Amino acid sequence: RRGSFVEMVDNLRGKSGQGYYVEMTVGSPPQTLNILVDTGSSNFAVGAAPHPFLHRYYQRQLSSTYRDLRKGVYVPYTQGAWAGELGTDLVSIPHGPNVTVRANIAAITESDKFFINGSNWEGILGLAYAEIARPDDSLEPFFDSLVKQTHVPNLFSLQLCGAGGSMIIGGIDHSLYTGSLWYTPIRREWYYEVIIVRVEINGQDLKMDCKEYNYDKSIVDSGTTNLRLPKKVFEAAVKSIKAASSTEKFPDGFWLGEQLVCWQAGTTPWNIFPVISLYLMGEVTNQSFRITILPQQYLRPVEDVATSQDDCYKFAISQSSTGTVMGAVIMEGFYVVFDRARKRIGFAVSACHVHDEFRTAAVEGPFVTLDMEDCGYN
Amino acid sequence: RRGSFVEMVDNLRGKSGQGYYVEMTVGSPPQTLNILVDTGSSNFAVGAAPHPFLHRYYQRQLSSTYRDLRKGVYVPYTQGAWAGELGTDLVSIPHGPNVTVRANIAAITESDKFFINGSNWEGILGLAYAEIARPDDSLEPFFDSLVKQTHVPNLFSLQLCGAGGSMIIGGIDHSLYTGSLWYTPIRREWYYEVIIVRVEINGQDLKMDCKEYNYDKSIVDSGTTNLRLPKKVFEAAVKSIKAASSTEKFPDGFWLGEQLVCWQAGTTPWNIFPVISLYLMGEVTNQSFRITILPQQYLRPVEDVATSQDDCYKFAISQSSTGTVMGAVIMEGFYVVFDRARKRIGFAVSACHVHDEFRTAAVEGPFVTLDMEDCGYN
Numbered sequence: 001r002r003g004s005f006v007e008m009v010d011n012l013r014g015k016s017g018q019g020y021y022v023e024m025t026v027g028s029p030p031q032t033l034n035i036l037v038d039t040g041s042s043n044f045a046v047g048a049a050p051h052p053f054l055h056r057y058y059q060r061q062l063s064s065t066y067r068d069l070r071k072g073v074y075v076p077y078t079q080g081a082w083a084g085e086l087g088t089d090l091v092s093i094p095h096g097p098n099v100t101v102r103a104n105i106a107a108i109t110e111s112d113k114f115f116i117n118g119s120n121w122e123g124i125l126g127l128a129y130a131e132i133a134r135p136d137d138s139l140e141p142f143f144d145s146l147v148k149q150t151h152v153p154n155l156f157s158l159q160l161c162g163a164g165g166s167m168i169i170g171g172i173d174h175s176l177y178t179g180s181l182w183y184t185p186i187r188r189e190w191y192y193e194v195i196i197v198r199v200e201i202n203g204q205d206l207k208m209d210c211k212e213y214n215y216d217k218s219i220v221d222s223g224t225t226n227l228r229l230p231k232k233v234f235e236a237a238v239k240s241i242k243a244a245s246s247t248e249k250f251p252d253g254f255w256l257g258e259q260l261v262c263w264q265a266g267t268t269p270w271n272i273f274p275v276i277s278l279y280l281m282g283e284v285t286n287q288s289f290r291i292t293i294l295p296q297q298y299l300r301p302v303e304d305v306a307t308s309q310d311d312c313y314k315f316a317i318s319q320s321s322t323g324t325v326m327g328a329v330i331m332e333g334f335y336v337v338f339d340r341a342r343k344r345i346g347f348a349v350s351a352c353h354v355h356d357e358f359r360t361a362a363v364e365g366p367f368v369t370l371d372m373e374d375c376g377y378n
Numbered sequence: 379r380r381g382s383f384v385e386m387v388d389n390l391r392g393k394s395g396q397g398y399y400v401e402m403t404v405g406s407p408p409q410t411l412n413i414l415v416d417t418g419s420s421n422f423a424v425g426a427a428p429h430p431f432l433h434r435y436y437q438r439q440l441s442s443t444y445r446d447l448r449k450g451v452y453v454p455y456t457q458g459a460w461a462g463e464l465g466t467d468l469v470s471i472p473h474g475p476n477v478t479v480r481a482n483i484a485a486i487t488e489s490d491k492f493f494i495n496g497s498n499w500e501g502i503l504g505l506a507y508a509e510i511a512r513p514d515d516s517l518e519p520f521f522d523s524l525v526k527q528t529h530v531p532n533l534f535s536l537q538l539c540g541a542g543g544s545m546i547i548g549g550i551d552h553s554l555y556t557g558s559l560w561y562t563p564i565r566r567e568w569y570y571e572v573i574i575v576r577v578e579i580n581g582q583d584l585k586m587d588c589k590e591y592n593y594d595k596s597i598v599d600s601g602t603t604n605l606r607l608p609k610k611v612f613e614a615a616v617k618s619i620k621a622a623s624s625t626e627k628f629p630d631g632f633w634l635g636e637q638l639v640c641w642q643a644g645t646t647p648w649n650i651f652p653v654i655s656l657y658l659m660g661e662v663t664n665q666s667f668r669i670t671i672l673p674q675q676y677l678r679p680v681e682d683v684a685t686s687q688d689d690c691y692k693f694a695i696s697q698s699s700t701g702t703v704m705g706a707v708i709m710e711g712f713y714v715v716f717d718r719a720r721k722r723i724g725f726a727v728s729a730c731h732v733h734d735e736f737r738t739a740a741v742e743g744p745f746v747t748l749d750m751e752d753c754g755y756n
């Protein structure tokens with residue numbers, strides 16, 4: 001019992017619906033806040049004024065090391081947006097690397113549908129690249145500052161445990177996964193973009209041109225709840241899923257995420273729902289691998305109706321007009337390694353993923369897939 | 379409710395008999411250890427090999443940032459000694475300042491009567507000056523490294539709570555004391571040396587030449603349990619204390635610290651013991667102030683004989699042949715500010731000191747004391 005990165009294990013709290021967060025200490029004297037881990041954006045920002053949904057916030061006048069950049073910043077997401085003021089300050093991650101850096105920080109002064117009631121986080125850590133940072137790519141993202149200012153290796157890994165988790169910074173911890181790690185190339189450094197080459201529902205190929213799977217783009221986003229799919233792919237996926245779970249019928253609104261379906265405590269018939277496999281481009285020509293998720297991943301729990309014996313679920317696969325988004329529900333079945341140094345993302349079966357005695361999430365390979373380059377949108 | 383240094387409040391654990399300690403994280407990846415706060419020495423050192431009394435230790439091969447200085451180091455104390463190897467590594471204090479520095483660190487490989495069974499600490503943080511560091515004054519002490527490498531103000535304060543406490547680094551927290559802070563000059567920067575100019579037992583002057591009080595030297599040491607006094611002063615003090623507590627008699631060994639005396643749970647007659655006042659040189663010519671401690675300070679508790687209703691106490695004033703040592707039992711009644719920047723030490727009544735409904739520890743002034751300069755040993 002030891003593990004070199006042991007102190008970083010279990011440093012995350014939260015859920016797929018409201019977000020996973022890590023503690024970060026900013027300023028001097030110390031001001032610790034809960035920050036959302038978001039690989040789908042690139043700005044580090046913290047609530048800096050009272051808000052109905054915030055238990056605490058960043059108080060710049062109390063930080064002797066805060067430096068005002070005299071520049072406003074506005075960041076819109078798929079869900080919500082906020083306005084703030086830019087500056088820099090000292091930042092450390094108590095349960096992360098043993099270093100302290102001066103990073104850019106956006107003080108959130110106003111917001112619309114950004115903070116989530118009961119989520120317990122007051123800020124957001126955009127872990128993606130400079131290309132998508134606001135106001136522009138000149139605002140160095142936090143991780144870039146970390147790598148340039150310290151000896152911390154240019155890599156971090158995430159293990160999101162559904163119904164906390166771990167964010168290993170600078171390395172990987174072997175106790176967080178089983179089996180082998182399979183890597184897919186980071187196609188371009190802006191979002192953590194990847195390429196999906198095949199999709200199966202219970203082993204059955206969806207039979208869509210792979211270009212549709214990445215139409216526009218496909219990204220790995222810890223800061224988005226669902227597995228979002230382009231319109232045409234969503235429709236085909238839902239039709240196949242319905243056909244594979246015909247043992248029981250559900251309203252159309254369920255598949256659209258507008259209706260919830262509940263079962264008596266501990267009675268959900270996981271067996272009636274199919275597994276979904278996403279094949280990703282590998283690191284060798286014409287070679288791919290696949291990650292398989294269970295209904296325990298794409299059917300997410302929602303607070304009991306009346307604190308009784310009722311497990312309510314929302315279909316966590318939804319439509320998108322901006323490409324595929326492999327969100328938290330997808331990541332919850334695996335240990336995901338964001339190997340920025342080698343421009344690749346690794347996947348391995350998570351040591352904490354939710355499963356049963358009949359099926360488990362899986363990462364298998366290799367498979368033979370030709371013309372994978374053509375799958376990408378230009 | 380806020381307090382700028384609020385995150386540092388309550389960052390200490392421990393007791394006067396075994397020591398007060400703070401968490402410190404060393405190396406990369408993070409290795410957190412419990413470290414003894416010692417203002418009576420100047421070396422930062424941590425157990426680096428298994429030991430019967432250690433729950434954990436520093437593993438250098440696991441730290442990528444460790445740098446070997448290829449130099450041995452030996453440090454003897456009044457109580458115990460250890461041998462080790464010098465090097466440097468990254469060091470942060472989780473509940474201290476929001477910075478990380480590269481400091482000298484001694485890896486303890488062998489020791490004799492140093493570590494204390496059940497103390498829960500695995501290292502020691504020497505907070506005194508370079509002059510008394512080992513091997514010599516060229517080995518920069520931790521706090522000096524902190525001040526030179528960061529913007530942290532050159533000052534720290536201690537509130538030791540007897541039967542944890544707080545170590546505020548870079549400032550003072552007003553919630554830790556009541557009344558005013560009175561300062562005494564740091565005579566010379568090696569140990570935290572001060573000058574005692576008068577001593578009273580229940581308001582009665584001990585009537586000894588003040589040179590005897592600082593014969594050799596007088597220091598403030600958070601890493602020593604008792605109030606240690608030069609032989610002649612100890613003898614006079616004990617004689618006066620005995621006379622002032624004549625309502626009940628105790629064996630000679632008690633006053634020598636060789637015998638313990640116990641009372642039924644919650645029955646100790648604190649009222650029969652006198653208060654002790656130490657007058658310290660002030661910051662203005664011919665002006666002094668005094669700190670007064672209660673028997674609750676100089677009579678320290680010792681683990682119940684058989685986990686029952688018996689409060690056992692050991693007389694915490696003892697003899698010394700190396701000058702006066704104002705140890706933890708003395709500090710426990712006050713908030714002590716080690717103002718290195720202004721070469722002075724402040725004292726204020728602690729918001730946590732142990733007292734009763736009849737008496738309280740006190741810090742009062744000013745008083746008129748002539749020829750205080752002559753009190754110091756040359």
Ligand SMILES: CCCC[C@H](N)[C@H](Cc1ccsc1)NC(=O)c1cc(NC[C@H]2C[C@@H]2C)nc(N(C)S(C)(=O)=O)c1
Nearest residue numbers: 016017018019040077078079080223224225226318328
């Ligand atoms: C331009 C793209 C921005 C992508 C960033 N990842 C941004 C970060 C953010 C903003 C507000 S909370 C988190 N995320 C979202 O916009 C975002 C957050 C969440 N659900 C809340 C997420 C915390 C839990 C993981 N859900 C969605 N969906 C559309 S969903 C229901 O999953 O189909 C989108």
Ligand SMILES: CCCC[C@H](N)[C@H](Cc1ccsc1)NC(=O)c1cc(NC[C@H]2C[C@@H]2C)nc(N(C)S(C)(=O)=O)c1
Nearest residue numbers: 394395396397418455456457458601602603604696706
């Ligand atoms: C050359 C002077 C060195 C002074 C350093 N402060 C050094 C640090 C240290 C070493 C081993 S444990 C702590 N302290 C001691 O030598 C030391 C530690 C403790 N008791 C244990 C102390 C932790 C509790 C406060 N007691 C004493 N006394 C003689 S006593 C019973 O109070 O009369 C001395």
